[PDB]
Design a binder for this molecule. Structure first.
Ligand SMILES: CCCCCCCCCCCCCCCCC[C@@H](O)O[C@H](CO[C@H](O)CCCCCCCCCCCCCCC)COP(=O)(O)OCC[N+](C)(C)C
Ligand SMILES: CCCCCCCCCCCCCCCCC[C@@H](O)O[C@H](CO[C@H](O)CCCCCCCCCCCCCCC)COP(=O)(O)OCC[N+](C)(C)C
Ligand SMILES: CCCCCCCC/C=C\CCCCCCCC(=O)OC[C@H](COP(=O)(O)OCCN)OC(=O)CCCCCCC/C=C\CCCCCCCC
Ligand SMILES: CCCCCCCC/C=C\CCCCCCCC(=O)OC[C@H](COP(=O)(O)OCCN)OC(=O)CCCCCCC/C=C\CCCCCCCC
Ligand SMILES: CCCCCCCC/C=C\CCCCCCCC(=O)O[C@H](COC(=O)CCCCCCC/C=C/CCCCCCCC)COP(=O)(O)OCCN
Ligand SMILES: CCCCCCCC/C=C\CCCCCCCC(=O)O[C@H](COC(=O)CCCCCCC/C=C/CCCCCCCC)COP(=O)(O)OCCN
Ligand code: SF4
Lengths: 59, 98, 70, 129, 83, 99, 303, 156
């Protein structure tokens, strides 16, 4: 079985075209990326305090 | 006639003479023309401001605009001349002789 | 955590606080405890020159009150 | 009298024009012209022409000499003649300059047409072929 | 009728910036000639005293010219206060 | 005077601090061991120059709005901006803004 | 006491720039699930000092063939212009009260490209020259729209005086009156300072770096003054100073955020962006903002 | 006397400044570079030590050789080393860079990067772990701390 990754056709009604124009002019997806980064700032980092803390190992 | 106007006219005459020398580098010819228009702008502005000719304050800006437009044209021409020879030397334009 | 960025930012804030505030204080100290007089348009400059002459101490900031009208 | 500051400014202007009038190493000539333009702008500003001096310093220096240097990079006494009164609550220079839109309709028309023709002429000349 | 609407719909897609710019420019050209406040702006410019009002020499034949600023005759600025 | 003093101070501080930066590592001893001329870049500069000239023409607008002849000044300002847009459009349609 | 005022304006900006780098590294690190420098000093507070000392004690690599004149002059011009452009700004009171302050800043920003041109041409390399040419072209291209947007916005202020902007925004910010111009202005300021997504390009290198970072801070401060008006009370200017500094810090952190959030443009892509999306919209909105006060009888006073 | 005290204090300040901000340029020659990029990853966060991520050769302080050095690449590495400002250090990361490693007896491999450039720190392993490389970088910091230039100039 196989899937299509980029086989969508954008709608050409007035509402869809207006939505795409609003995206182009007001930079909505750029704001979405900014929001993702902003949210990702307010979470705890993954850094450990070497050499006072050490990475996990195995026997 | 004060000494400042005489100094500006001397500067313009020096720029014109340097334009007329033509050591090389037609780019220097354009530079001399732009120095000439700069001296013109400065002295015209000084004269107009001094006599309080309020409506004449239009004239320097106009001059500047037009002169700069001329410079653009000249630069374009230079490029094409260089585009034929690779250098902007004056002596390369010896094809036409009197 | 994220608040560990706050110290350095605070330093920047302090560095950005110094200029403006300083100017104001200097404008209070050089201009006799008042705002520095702005002079565009050449009429305010005439007002300042008239103030300088009337005081007698050659300073525009000193203000001659009504008490000087006799 | 600050030793006739305008006199020193004019002399430095003349010295700069003499300096690049020998046209040595055209970038050095352009830098001499930059210094000369700065000196002339200082002359105009000290005279009292703030707006016209700033027009010089912006348009001339930042556009025209910048484009000149860019293309080259591609390749290889006083104080006596002045006034007595004041100007009001405005600057006469600004009023006279802004009169271009109310008084100078003809000037605006001819300058705009000339600039449009300049753009067209530049395109045609640089077309090549 | 249909062709114009089709052209505008095709331009609103894949060229929204140009459509917006042309619309804004056309509105800026058209609207001032229809607004009633442009005359108000002209009048406001007229009422801004930049110069000293030089008095007129009286000859007894100017009933419309006041002798004092508090006199009723002369231009008024109550409309500007109402604005 | 004040502007001259400020400019002199800024230039002097920059020059002194550049010189100390350039001379502090020069006191200690160490080892101490073309043509193409693209044509589009010239058109970009020329277009910038022309549009800067038209901006210079547009600059007196803040004072132009108090003239009592508002209709004429509005017409002339709109005319100047229309011709600026026309220059941009002509250079656009003639393939002057391509790479 | 004018010398003291000049020094108290000129030194804190340099300190602010040094600490900005720590903030930029620290802000970016926490945005990437890590930390910034937190070892040199209590919270990385000593990192800028160590960086400065190391850079000042490192050998300078003079090209051994370049024009020493322009090689020295270019950082001088960069620092001089960067420090000069702070003089006109009013926080609340400006160091120098210029009638045409905005025009003066425009002229200085126009000069700013000579340092790039001279650094490229004195580098004695064809590739660095090509890069410098690209940078200069981008800078002039975006300063065109900067100037047009700036005059369109000032059409509601009534003059080129920077202090009057405080009087204009005593009741409402300028961002509400014209946000699209503010959007294009923000993008144009990003593209002017060669900041991501437009970042296509020992001692003198540090000089250029401080010049660029000071220009970044000054651009954010000018944007905050122009579009986010802070209320000024004449009897206590400290409140205005605090508000202005907070807004400037927010805008600088927004630049860092945008750097951390996006990929970068190609050269032709940003050229097309400007010349085919910003210039037409800028001209249309300039026409609109010329005609708007006349339509509404809301012309600003000063003339 | 005070003459030795002042130079000792200035030397300590200079050493602290140099070791508290080490700017490396990294030759990502092979598989060792992948652990290099894990030392810049959020878990270890090289940047928190003052070690900047991917500095330019013109303003770099330490050279990290991470991977096999072939004969075809040695002149380029030597040129890049020669193009560095004087206070420079070289860290040999991994077994291939240390002694040729698992291609030691090869016709096209330099048997150790120290045939080309002098090496300050040798980091063992194939590849050495991110923590191991961090340990090596920290060790280089201590070595820089131990050096003394103003004192030597004073006694000379
Ligand atoms: C009559 C000839 C027509 C055919 C020949 C055309 C020749 C060349 C075209 C240019 C001529 C156009 C006439 C404009 C002359 C300017 C004077 C006239 O227009 O009066 C002005 C009136 O202004 C009008 O608004 C002029 C508007 C017309 C200009 C707009 C478009 C112009 C385009 C013409 C060709 C340009 C290039 C091609 C573009 C397609 C003055 O304003 P006013 O208020 O009374 O007085 C001001 C002085 N105050 C302050 C003391 C009171
Ligand atoms: C105003 C005039 C300026 C003139 C120019 C000077 C520029 C500014 C000078 C100020 C610089 C601050 C220096 C402070 C550095 C000390 C930091 C301290 O924490 O270091 C400790 C002590 O280390 C060193 O011994 C410190 C020596 C630093 C110099 C000491 C005094 C120097 C002052 C002399 C200044 C006079 C200048 C005269 C010429 C103008 C240990 O840190 P370190 O080991 O790394 O990290 C270990 C990491 N662990 C903990 C996680 C394991
Ligand atoms: C570079 C900076 C040049 C511009 C400096 C002055 C700009 C300015 O607008 O200030 C003018 C100021 C006040 O004018 P307004 O703002 O209109 O209001 C005051 C009236 N109440 O008055 C002055 O002009 C005083 C200073 C003028 C003399 C010096 C000006 C700069 C001349 C520099 C000459 C040297 C240049 C050398 C080469 C330059 C290459 C970058
Ligand atoms: C944001 C904050 C910014 C702060 C501003 C920066 C402040 C600057 C502070 C400067 C710190 C002092 C730096 C001194 C270190 C100089 C470099 C150095 O160590 O050179 C060692 C060098 C080794 O040379 P040799 O052994 O003879 O030859 C071997 C090579 N074949 O020895 C020297 O040259 C010594 C130089 C004299 C230093 C004596 C005084 C100490 C330095 C004080 C700074 C002087 C100017 C201020
Ligand atoms: C009733 C009277 C009203 C009068 C009419 C007014 C109506 C206004 C309607 C339109 C206004 C919108 C204009 C805003 C600017 C739009 C420009 C634009 O859309 O250009 C984009 C380009 O925009 C960008 O790509 C810029 C992205 C740069 C990265 C910056 C990140 C954005 C987020 C940062 C926050 C922004 C903060 C703004 C406020 C700043 C305050 C100072 C188009 O590019 P493409 O989508 O690739 O298509 C072109 C091919 N045909
Ligand atoms: C006299 C009015 C002026 C005032 C308004 C305008 C001011 C500034 C705007 C104009 C600036 C110059 C614009 C230059 C136009 C050039 C167009 C062009 O040639 O580009 C075409 C595309 O242009 C077109 O699409 C043709 C016209 C499209 C529509 C233009 C507007 C027409 C009317 C639309 C709005 C009408 C009024 C608004 C009402 C809308 C409802 C609110 C090709 O695009 P490429 O970039 O080459 O693509 C190649 C890569 N894929
Ligand atoms: S040393 Fe080991 S891990 Fe590193 S490149 Fe060589 S074989 Fe791969």
């Amino acid at each position: 079985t196989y899937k299509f990754v980029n086989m969508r056709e954008p709608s050409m009604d007035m509402k869809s075209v207006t939505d795409r124009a609003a995206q182009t002019l007001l930079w909505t997806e750029l704001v979405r990326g900014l929001g993702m980064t902003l949210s990702y700032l307010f979470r705890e980092p993954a850094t450990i305090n070497y050499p006072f803390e050490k990475g996990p190992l195995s026997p | 006639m004060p000494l400042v106007y005489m100094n500006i006219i001397m500067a313009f005459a020096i720029a014109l003479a340097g334009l007329l020398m033509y050591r090389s580098h037609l780019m220097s010819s354009l530079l001399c023309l732009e120095g000439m228009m700069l001296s013109l702008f400065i002295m015209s502005t000084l004269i107009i401001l001094n006599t309080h000719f309020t409506l004449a304050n239009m004239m320097p800006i106009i001059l500047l605009v037009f002169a700069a437009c001329e410079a653009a044209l000249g630069l374009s021409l230079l490029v094409m001349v260089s585009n034929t020879y690779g250098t902007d030397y004056v002596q390369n334009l010896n094809l036409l002789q009197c | 955590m994220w608040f560990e960025i706050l110290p350095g930012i605070a330093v920047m804030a302090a560095c950005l606080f110094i200029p403006g505030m300083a100017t104001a204080h200097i404008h209070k100290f050089t201009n006799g405890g008042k705002e520095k007089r702005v002079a565009h348009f050449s009429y305010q400059w005439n007002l300042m020159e008239r103030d300088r002459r009337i005081s007698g101490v050659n300073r525009y900031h000193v203000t001659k009150g009504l008490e000087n009208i006799d | 009298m600050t030793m006739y500051i305008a006199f020193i400014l004019s002399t430095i202007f003349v010295i700069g024009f003499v300096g690049f009038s020998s046209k040595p190493s055209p970038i050095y000539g352009g830098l001499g012209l930059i210094v000369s333009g700065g000196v002339g702008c200082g002359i105009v500003l000290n005279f009292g022409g703030s707006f016209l001096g700033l027009m010089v310093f912006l348009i001339y220096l930042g556009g025209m000499l910048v484009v000149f240097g860019y293309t080259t990079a591609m390749a290889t006494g006083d104080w006596v003649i002045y006034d007595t009164g004041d100007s009001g609550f405005f600057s006469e220079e600004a009023m006279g300059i802004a009169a271009l839109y109310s008084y100078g309709t003809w000037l605006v028309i001819v300058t705009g047409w000339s600039l449009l023709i300049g753009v067209v002429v530049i395109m045609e000349i640089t077309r090549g072929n | 009728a249909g062709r114009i609407a089709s052209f505008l719909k095709n331009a609103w897609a894949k060229e929204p910036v140009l459509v917006a710019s042309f619309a804004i420019g056309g509105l800026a050209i058209i609207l001032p000639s229809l607004s009633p406040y442009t005359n108000y702006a002209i009048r406001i410019n007229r009422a801004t005293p930049y110069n000293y009002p030089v008095p007129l020499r009286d000859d007894g034949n100017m009933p419309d010219v006041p002798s004092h600023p508090q006199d009723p005759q002369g231009p008024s600025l109550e409309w500007l206060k109402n604005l | 005077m004040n502007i001259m003093l400020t400019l002199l101070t800024n230039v002097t501080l920059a020059s002194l601090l550049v010189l100390i930066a350039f001379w502090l590592p020069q006191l200690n001893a160490y080892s101490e061991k073309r043509l193409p001329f693209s044509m589009k870049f010239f058109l970009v500069a020329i277009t910038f120059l022309l549009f800067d000239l038209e901006i210079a023409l547009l600059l007196p607008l803040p004072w132009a709005s108090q003239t009592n002849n508002l209709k004429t000044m509005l017409t002339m300002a709109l005319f100047l901006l229309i011709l600026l847009a026309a220059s941009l459009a002509y250079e656009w349609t003639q393939k002057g803004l391509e790479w | 006491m004018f010398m003291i005022n000049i020094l108290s304006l000129i030194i804190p900006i340099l300190l602010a720039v040094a600490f900005l780098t720590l903030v930029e590294r620290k802000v970016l690190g926490y945005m990437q699930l890590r930390k910034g420098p937190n070892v040199v000093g209590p919270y990385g507070l000593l990192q800028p000092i160590a960086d400065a000392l190391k850079l000042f004690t490192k050998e300078p690599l003079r090209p051994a063939t370049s024009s020493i004149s322009m090689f020295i002059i270019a950082p001088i011009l960069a620092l001089s212009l960067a420090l000069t452009m702070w003089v006109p700004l009013p926080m609340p009171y400006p160091l120098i009260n210029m009638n045409l302050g905005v025009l003066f800043m425009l002229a200085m920003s126009s000069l700013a490209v000579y340092s790039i041109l001279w650094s490229g041409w004195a580098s004695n390399s064809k590739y660095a020259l090509i890069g410098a040419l690209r940078a200069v072209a981008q800078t002039i291209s975006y300063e065109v729209t900067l100037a047009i947007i700036l005059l369109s916005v000032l059409l509601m202020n009534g003059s080129y005086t920077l202090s009057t902007l405080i009087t204009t925004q005593e009741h409402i910010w300028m961002i509400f009156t014209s946000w699209p111009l503010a959007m294009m202005w923000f993008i144009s300021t990003l593209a002017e300072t060669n900041r991501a997504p437009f970042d296509l390009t020992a001692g003198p290198f540090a000089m250029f770096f401080m010049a660029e970072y000071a220009n970044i801070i000054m651009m954010n401060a000018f944007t905050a003054i122009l579009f986010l008006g802070a209320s000024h009370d004449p009897h206590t200017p400290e409140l205005y100073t605090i508000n202005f500094v907070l807004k400037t810090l927010a805008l600088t952190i927004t630049f860092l955020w945008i750097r951390a959030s996006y990929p970068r443009f190609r050269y032709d892509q940003l050229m097309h962006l400007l010349w085919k999306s910003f210039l037409p919209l800028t001209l249309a909105l300039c026409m609109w903002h010329i005609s708007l006060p006349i339509m509404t009888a809301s012309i600003p006073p000063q003339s | 006397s005070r003459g030795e005290y002042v130079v000792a204090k200035l030397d300590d300040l200079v050493n602290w400044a140099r070791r508290s901000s080490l700017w490396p340029m990294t030759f990502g020659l092979a598989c060792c570079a992948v652990e290099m990029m894990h030392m810049a990853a959020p878990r270890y966060d090289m940047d928190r030590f003052g070690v900047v991520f991917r500095a330019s050769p013109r303003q770099s302080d330490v050279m990290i050789v991470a991977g096999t050095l072939t004969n075809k690449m040695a002149p380029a590495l030597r040129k890049v080393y020669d193009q560095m400002p004087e206070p420079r250090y070289v860290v040999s990361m991994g077994s291939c860079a240390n002694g040729g490693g698992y291609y030691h007896y090869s016709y096209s491999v330099v048997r150790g990067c120290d045939r080309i450039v002098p090496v300050d720190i040798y980091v063992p392993g194939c590849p050495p772990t991110a923590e191991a490389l961090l340990y090596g970088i920290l060790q280089l910091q201590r070595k820089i701390k131990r050096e003394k230039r103003l004192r030597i100039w004073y006694r000379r």
